Design a binder for this molecule. Structure first.
Ligand SMILES: Nc1ncnc2c1ncn2[C@@H]1O[C@H](COP(=O)(O)OP(=O)(O)O)[C@@H](O)[C@H]1O
Lengths: 19, 600, 459, 181, 182, 65, 459
């Protein structure tokens, strides 16, 4: 769960970076 | 020149304007100049694991860029000193500040520059003599125990242009000037070495000599060697710190570096209180063991990021004294705390974790740290031989040895002194679990045992056989009881109980069992194994006869002898001489023989 | 002193869980304290957990419920959290945040001390060696405490850890045959526990020398993260500046650990075992390691954290890390309590790391160590004999097993069992230990050297 | 030898220089002709004055002996010989016996495992203690015994199993270890 | 007495004989390893001598201005094509500056024609290349964070390390044991 | 003892003989390598220098206008 | 050949663990090789892990310590990692990156071969049916190896897997009714292990036919990502081009998997089990599946990886995914090692999937398959009987159960147990197997056809 939550947070940050 | 603090998430700071800052470079963050090390570098911003508490650090604070890696000053003045994680002399801090705390950002020198050391140059060296890294170009009479050899820094070489005459020189005075390719290098007694770079050696010779601890179970069943790597996993209260301190007090290592990486501070205070009183005899003169012990203390509540530095500093100091020809022993008080510090810094960096949150590079870090231990043929011109025996205690959370730190450690360390919580609760100290523990140096040490203690290897083998047989019989008895046990099985059980209670366990806080010389460690085992042999012989050879000798007959007839075997441990190596102890053990053997003959 | 006017920000960018987030902060300071005036005038407090550029993540102590984005006004104190400390704090009751709840005035500070304190220079730290006579046989006899020791009480929900701690308070004194100031912090303790401790300190004439920090069950959860530190800070002031001997009692460190877990989960920090933060060891060490004596100062701080083991699991992260940090533990046992043995202290899983030096010749008596070790060995063997008897029955026990069972019975009846107000001296405890050990013949006492047995056994 | 090439070749140059210095110290008179010829390939770079850089370039190019294992073995042989000579300094050894000791050391497979190394370590314990020891009765007795031992070793040498030398070693070491009171 | 003493003496002698045989085997292995490595090092030294001869030949060729001008034009144009930047700088040897100037003059129009991209190429008259270098050029982009090193010292190395299989096959003959080249 | 001494002498003599033999073999191999390289030095050098001098400037294939 | 000058970028945009992310790269090439000159002149090498427009996430083999932005010069070689390969690579020692560490010259390339290898058409891959007489009865007898097979050695920390591997290396040979060339890839082996293997090869006289790749524990941990491929590439060159029967030993696939996990976590990829990359199966397969024979060739590549199972857990992702790929596994047991048996090969969980076609009449003998099957059956039944005995006691065991226990004892004492320098031919191993099977009556050997019982049992 911690790894998946961390991956989700990183994906959100990357999406913001692309936007 | 200056970066600027940008953010602070705990021990991890971020800093803008650090375009050319190298990875693992050392910077000073904040106005108090808290030391820190760059660990990642994105764009023109760096991120710094600060070795001091970052509370009160504000965005925009200067971050000075010192174009050097985390390094230690190596030279006279280390022995007998207690440093912190980043090698600041805590005694000098206390004297300078006159306060019971460690000020944040205090910048006192690692080695005092005021003391005048007695320096005698190497006689052969002259102007125009080719000298290279690791060459001993002088000896500094640091104290009665340690002749601090003064060696060229590794990666330094050239022709000598000036070698100082013998006399009193301080750590800042130039002692040796040399030149290479025209460029001239001046050298005082102190050399700065990056802590994360392994100090080179000509060769890493195989480990071939025991690291005689004071403990019977460690010396006999699970030997360690000078230059080996050891681990001591165990729950809280099992006794790994006490094993480390007993090895620090009574062992054949010319130097001992205690690293206290992330453990109690009262333990470091206890070390400082005890060691000055403890003494060892050199040339018939008693000299304190603190004259050869160096402490690198970073207690549990001191900055987390410093713990890693502590370990590294520790090993570097050990390596420095290995290159002189001394058999250093580095006690890593708890590598679990170092792993936890790595995990915290990783969490602040939002790195992807490995098992149980630890970083993906924990195993690599532990392996690289343990690989610095082997016995070596030191660098430099004078042929020498040093060692760094790394004894690294592990603290598995919940006493579970599946811990990632413990599992990674057992894949590196060659000796495994696993401690049992149940044995500790029974006060069966040292709590070493004789079943799971192992030492991969026994085959490399039989060469030495057969020539110094020729009678010991078979005794060790028989003792381990007895313990394994007792384990099997106990597994059976727990469910079936002792009613159906064969008589020889009863003898195995009872001699195994004798070995456990009266040979393996050793009260380390008594005048007689604090240190158990190897002549004792082998004499006691010889007597117990002889009793086992005689009891088994009697029982087996009288099984067919009508006068069946059993365990009960032996116990009733040999109560006094059994009590003497149990009390063999109480012999005092110092109050009672070695000759007296050996004679008393021989007399007990004679009593055993006579009693068995009178019984059969 | 800070003379510049402090900035008040209405620029609350976002809120999430217990973390307010402020933007356009001018040079935020990490760990800085912030005062939040909510829309309805409710004044809360928070601590800057992180700074980044012009952003500051403020951890509100009272919780973020009711926080507005456009109307909440956060004024930055310009300094880290600092407790106002004075010797008058002895004999006062404060809430978990240090604000008085006894209808007295605020603390007229003698000094403003950093709540987090500082680690004591190990070279200047003195090793505790003055034994405290808690009066409890199970503690003095086999887990003796030293003045300046971190020795928590491991217990479970419903067990008499409060009673044992109160007894230690009311009959703790040096073995010199002076009062102990007490600093009592409570985290998430029901009203009954707080009333019990307060009424026990009042019944005895000690309330003059007791300072209480109370954070009951209904009080803010995050505030429990500062309730210990405040208390310890006070103790430090009373110990290392006023030269008092301060017994610090932190009640329900399980509640403090769970509050820390809540904050870490809000911050999504790397978890350790069972969801607790990966740094819970470091934080519990920051709490516990504020104990012991110090060179050149005649004061001391003795810590006795009381922590509830979840599900009576001594391997749970809270008790496990506490044992890793502290210098021992007093293990309150449910099996003994259900049998109505008080104090239900199971000496076998208990430990005192400074007992080895607080006992011997000089301090207490010279048979203390041997008697304690032999009692431990015989008790463990008696428990083993009980376990084997559960399987093989009475008739299969040898005479030695019967000796060990008799020792176990008389040990749990005469040594462990003790009146709630009975103050046994260390010598009485050792005499009881010897009268129990005399069950066995000398030859069965293999821990005690013959020199000690010959002198002490016959009597 | 996992040394970087630069470090390895600097160490080779250092070993050559150390062999030269050991030869000069043991036999400044060049009387030990046999040993000097045995070490010609390494002593040529010191008899003919080369700068450190020239010898380093020769080592890199292969002209110099650039095998750290062989150089270390030879340097250890000469170091042990010089240690024997210095610990025997006042009682000069005969050239024939010096050559015999050198030949025995060369033959030995591993000198750090040799009984010769252990005997030299014992003699050095005695001599190092006596270097600074004040004239107390123990120190005078140790000085006399060490002088007799040095004379005997100069006459015979440490390669042999001479019972007299062994017994003198035992007694002198026991006196050294015995308490000063 | 004879039996036991004899048994111990045979044990000692046989153990010493086994040790001697092991030492002989180890000495043999070390000797053969040293021989192999010495032959390999001789081969490497011969190849390095060949490379040094090639360096000398290039240093001779650069002196022939008629050939060096064409070579320099090729090198400069190749660097420009590798970079494909709007603004580029050319580092050249100080004495080769006229030739590099002519090369850039030739290359700019051809570069524009071939890449349809306008370009500004400036010869770095401040920081020239070391004068010991055999020749060639070094083309940096506008900010100098990207460079292409078209020096002869670099081109010879680049080609030779790729050609090493052919040099090995030619100088020291092919391999008989290599049955399949795929 | 005497048998051991004879074995040691034989081992030493064989070791010396074979060390000389392998030194001679190494010298022979090096001489053969030198002779084989001298025949193809010029050809390989000419090919290498011709490849160096033939620049052939070219653009990356992926470049698109 | 690549004649175009290489592009050097001082444009490093970030450093993160082993990764160096560059920007403004002209047409990045995936898996391209980069040469990083550090500010102080230290030259390292890396491989482009991914490309995105003008970016390139290089992965440095020697580690990123000391690298700084604005000064590190990354020169892009313009090609994937093509290692040089020559026949004279036999008798050489190289580090994990292929550079000499035996003081010899750099490899004079006979060819430049991609380390990733060239996939082999399954239509023209010969099925290996030639048995390897390793001399270890626990492998020859029951888990026989066929020349060209992939069969790891599953073990744990402290077990003698290195000794077993050395024994196989020095005893491997065909069954008598062409000597192996060993290629060694050490990844994370301490100095003791590398020295042990090197000394074992020198002592046994095989060093002329051994090529060692050493990546010790102190060496960089991203280098061991290429260390096995390099080794295998050389093996392929020696096997499919020089016609040599190669035996490839890969010391610690656990350390290689840890390096994979390190790179994956640095890349912040979506993790698999235990944090290992989701693509560990494919990365491990690209290494294991390079064994075997091919049509037209005469050489082969026998592959014997060695794994250190964490916590002795054969379900751990590394051993699990290694079992899914490799054809069997040799399983070193901790219990047998503790009981001082050598080799500690537990034949119950270990198997060789190409044993059935490698044994039998003409290859080894008629009874091989039946003898192995019956030994395995008797061993399993004996283990079950031992488990039952541990609970109910021996007095409740029937005569046949006692026979099974006797077989188990004599099987672990005579068949599995074996001297480290003793190579038992397959026939001696089968004779020992028959001597152990003769303990039971013919009526209890159910898995042996009567046609073979009548021929081999009565002897
Ligand atoms: N050799 C020993 N002799 C006597 N007591 C010991 C010994 N080893 C450990 N102990 C006991 O174990 C307790 C725990 O010691 P320590 O090792 O400091 O704990 P930890 O396991 O947390 O390091 C101590 O209080 C000490 O009394």
């Amino acid at each position: 769960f911690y790894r998946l939550k961390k991956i989700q947070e990183k994906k959100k940050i990357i999406k913001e970076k692309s936007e | 020149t200056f970066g600027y603090v940008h953010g602070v998430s705990g021990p991890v700071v971020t800093a803008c304007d650090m375009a050319g800052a190298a990875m693992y470079e050392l910077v000073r963050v904040g106005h108090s100049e808290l030391v820190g090390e760059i660990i990642r570098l994105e764009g023109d911003m760096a991120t710094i694991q600060v070795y001091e508490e970052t509370s009160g650090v504000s965005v925009g604070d200067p971050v000075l860029r010192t174009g050097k890696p985390l390094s230690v000053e190596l030279g006279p003045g280390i022995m007998g000193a207690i440093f912190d994680g980043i090698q600041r002399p805590l005694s000098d801090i206390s004297s300078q500040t006159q306060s019971i705390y460690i000020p944040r950002g205090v910048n006192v020198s690692a080695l005092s520059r005021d003391i005048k050391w007695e320096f005698i140059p190497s006689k052969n060296l002259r102007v125009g003599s080719h000298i290279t890294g690791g060459d001993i170009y002088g000896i500094v009479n640091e104290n009665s125990l340690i002749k601090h050899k003064i060696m060229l820094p590794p990666r330094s070489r050239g022709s000598v242009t000036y070698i100082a005459p013998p006399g009193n020189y301080d750590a800042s005075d130039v002692v040796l000037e040399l030149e290479f390719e025209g460029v001239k290098e001046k050298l005082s007694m102190v050399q700065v070495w990056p802590v994360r770079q392994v100090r080179p050696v000509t060769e890493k010779l195989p480990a071939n000599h025991p690291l005689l601890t004071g403990q019977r179970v460690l010396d006999a069943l699970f030997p360690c060697v000078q230059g080996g790597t050891t681990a001591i996993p165990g729950a809280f209260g099992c006794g790994k710190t006490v094993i480390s301190q007993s090895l620090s007090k009574y062992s054949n290592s010319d130097v001992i570096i205690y690293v206290g990486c992330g453990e109690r501070g009262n333990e470091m205070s206890e070390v400082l209180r005890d060691f000055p009183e403890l003494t060892m005899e050199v040339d018939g003169k008693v000299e304190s063991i603190m004259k050869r012990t160096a402490l690198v203390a970073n207690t549990s509540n001191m900055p987390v990021a410093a713990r890693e530095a502590s370990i590294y500093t520790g090993i570097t100091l050990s390596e420095y004294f290995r290159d002189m020809g001394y058999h250093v022993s580095m006690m890593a008080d708890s590598t679990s705390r170092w792993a936890e510090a790595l995990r915290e810094i990783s969490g602040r960096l939002a790195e992807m974790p490995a098992d149980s949150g630890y970083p993906a590079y924990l195993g690599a870090r532990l392996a690289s740290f343990y690989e610095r231990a082997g016995r070596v043929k030191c660098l430099g011109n004078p042929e020498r031989e040093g060692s760094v025996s790394i004894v690294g205690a592990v603290s598995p959370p919940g006493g579970d040895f599946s811990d990632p730190v413990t599992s990674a450690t057992l894949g590196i360390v060659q000796v495994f002194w696993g401690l049992d919580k149940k044995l500790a609760q029974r006060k069966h100290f040292p709590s070493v679990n004789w079943l799971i523990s192992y030492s991969k140096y026994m085959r490399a040490l039989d060469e030495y045992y057969d020539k110094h203690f020729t009678e010991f290897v078979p005794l060790r083998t028989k003792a381990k056989e007895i313990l394994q047989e007792e384990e099997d019989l106990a597994e059976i008895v727990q469910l079936v009881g002792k009613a159906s046990l064969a008589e020889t099985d009863k003898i195995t059980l009872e001699v195994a109980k004798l070995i456990k209670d009266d040979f393996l366990q050793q009260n380390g806080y008594t005048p007689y069992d604090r240190f158990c010389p190897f002549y004792k460690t082998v004499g006691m085992l010889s007597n117990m194994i002889s009793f086992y042999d005689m009891a088994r012989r009697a029982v087996e050879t009288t099984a067919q006869s009508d006068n069946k000798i059993t365990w009960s007959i032996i116990r009733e007839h040999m109560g006094e002898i059994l009590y003497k075997l149990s009390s063999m441990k109480f012999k005092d190596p110092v109050k009672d001489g070695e000759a007296k102890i050996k004679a008393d053990y021989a007399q007990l053997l004679e009593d055993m023989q006579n009693a068995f003959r009178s019984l059969e | 002193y800070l003379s510049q006017p402090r900035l008040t920000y209405k620029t609350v960018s976002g809120v999430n869980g217990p973390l307010v987030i402020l933007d356009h902060v001018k040079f935020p300071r990490y760990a800085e304290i912030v005062h939040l005036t909510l829309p309805d005038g409710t004044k809360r407090s928070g601590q800057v957990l992180e700074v980044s550029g012009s952003k500051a993540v403020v951890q509100v102590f009272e919780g973020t419920s009711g926080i507005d984005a456009k109307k909440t006004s956060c004024e930055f104190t310009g300094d880290i959290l600092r407790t106002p400390v004075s010797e008058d704090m002895l004999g006062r009751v404060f809430n978990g945040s240090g604000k008085p709840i006894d209808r007295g005035p605020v603390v007229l500070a003698e000094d403003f001390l950093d709540i987090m304190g500082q680690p004591i220079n190990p070279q200047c730290r003195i090793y505790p060696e003055e034994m405290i006579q808690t009066g409890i046989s199970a503690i003095d006899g086999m887990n003796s405490i030293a003045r300046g020791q971190k020795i928590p009480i491991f217990s479970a929900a419903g067990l008499p850890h409060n009673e044992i701690a109160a007894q230690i308070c009311r009959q703790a004194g040096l073995v010199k045959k002076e009062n102990f100031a007490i600093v009592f912090a409570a985290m998430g303790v029901n009203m009954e526990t707080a009333r019990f401790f307060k009424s026990d300190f009042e019944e005895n004439g000690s309330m003059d020398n007791v300072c209480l920090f109370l954070n009951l069950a209904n009080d803010p959860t995050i505030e429990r993260i500062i309730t210990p530190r405040l208390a310890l800070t006070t103790a430090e002031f009373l110990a290392y500046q006023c030269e008092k001997h301060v017994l610090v009692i932190l009640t329900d460190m399980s509640s403090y650990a769970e509050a820390l877990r809540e904050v870490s989960a809000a911050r999504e920090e790397v978890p350790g075992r069972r969801g607790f933060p990966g740094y819970m060891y470091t934080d519990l060490a920051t709490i516990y390691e504020r104990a012991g004596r110090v060179e050149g100062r005649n004061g001391s701080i003795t810590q006795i954290p009381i922590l509830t083991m979840p599900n009576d699991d001594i391997t749970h992260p809270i008790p496990d890390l506490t044992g890793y940090i502290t210098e021992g533990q007093i293990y309150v046992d449910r099996q003994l309590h259900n049998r109505q043995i008080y104090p239900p202290i199971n000496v076998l899983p208990s430990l005192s790391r400074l007992m080895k030096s607080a006992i011997g010749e000089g301090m207490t008596r010279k048979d203390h160590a041997d008697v304690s070790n032999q009692l431990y060995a015989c008790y463990a063997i008696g428990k083993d004999v009980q376990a084997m008897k559960a399987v093989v029955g009475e008739e299969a026990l040898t005479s030695d097993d019967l000796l060990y069972l008799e020792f176990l019975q008389k040990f749990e009846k005469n040594f462990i069992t003790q009146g709630p107000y009975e103050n046994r001296t260390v010598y009485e405890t050792l005499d009881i230990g010897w009268q129990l050990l005399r069950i066995f013949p000398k030859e069965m006492l293999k821990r005690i050297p013959q020199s000690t047995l010959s002198e002490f056994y016959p009597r | 030898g996992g040394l970087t090439s630069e470090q390895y070749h600097s160490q080779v140059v250092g070993k050559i220089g150390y062999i030269a210095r050991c030869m000069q110290t043991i036999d400044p008179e060049n009387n030990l002709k046999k040993i000097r010829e045995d070490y010609q390939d390494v002593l040529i770079w010191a008899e003919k004055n080369y700068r450190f850089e020239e010898i380093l370039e020769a080592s890199k190019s292969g002209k110099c002996p650039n095998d750290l294992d062989a150089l270390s073995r030879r340097s250890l042989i000469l170091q042990e010989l010089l240690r024997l000579v210095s610990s025997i300094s006042p009682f000069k050894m005969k050239l024939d016996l010096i050559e015999s000791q050198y030949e025995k050391m060369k033959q030995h497979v591993n000198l750090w495992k040799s009984d010769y190394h252990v005997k030299l370590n014992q003699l050095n314990q005695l001599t190092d203690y006596l270097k600074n020891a004040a004239p107390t009765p123990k120190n005078n007795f140790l000085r006399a015994m060490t002088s007799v031992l040095q004379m005997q070793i100069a006459q015979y040498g440490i390669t042999e199993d001479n019972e007299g030398i062994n017994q003198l070693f035992k007694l002198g070491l026991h006196l050294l270890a015995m308490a000063n009171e | 007495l004879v039996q036991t003493q004899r048994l111990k003496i045979m044990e000692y002698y046989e153990k010493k004989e086994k040790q001697i045989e092991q030492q002989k085997k180890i000495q043999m292995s070390n000797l053969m390893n040293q021989a192999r490595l010495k032959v390999l090092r001789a081969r490497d030294d011969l190849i390095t001598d060949l490379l040094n001869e090639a360096k000398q030949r290039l240093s001779k060729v650069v002196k022939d201005t008629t050939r060096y001008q064409v070579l320099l034009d090729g090198l400069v144009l190749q660097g420009l094509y590798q970079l494909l930047e709007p603004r580029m700088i050319v580092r050249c040897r100080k004495q080769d500056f006229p030739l590099v100037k002519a090369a850039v003059q030739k290359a700019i129009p051809m570069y524009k024609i071939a890449t349809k991209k306008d370009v500004d190429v400036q010869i770095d008259l401040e920081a020239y290349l070391p004068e010991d270098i055999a020749g060639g050029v070094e083309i940096y982009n506008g900010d100098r964070k990207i460079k292409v090193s078209n020096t002869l010292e670099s081109r010879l190395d680049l080609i030779a390390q790729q050609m090493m299989p052919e040099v090995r096959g030619a100088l020291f003959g092919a391999n008989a044991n290599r049955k399949f080249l795929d | 003892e005497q048998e051991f001494q004879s074995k040691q002498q034989a081992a030493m003599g064989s070791q010396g003989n074979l060390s000389a033999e392998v030194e001679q073999a190494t010298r022979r191999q090096v001489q053969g390598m030198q002779s084989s390289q001298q025949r193809n030095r010029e050809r390989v050098l000419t090919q290498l220098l011709g490849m160096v001098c033939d620049v052939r400037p070219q653009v990356h294939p992926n470049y698109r206008i």
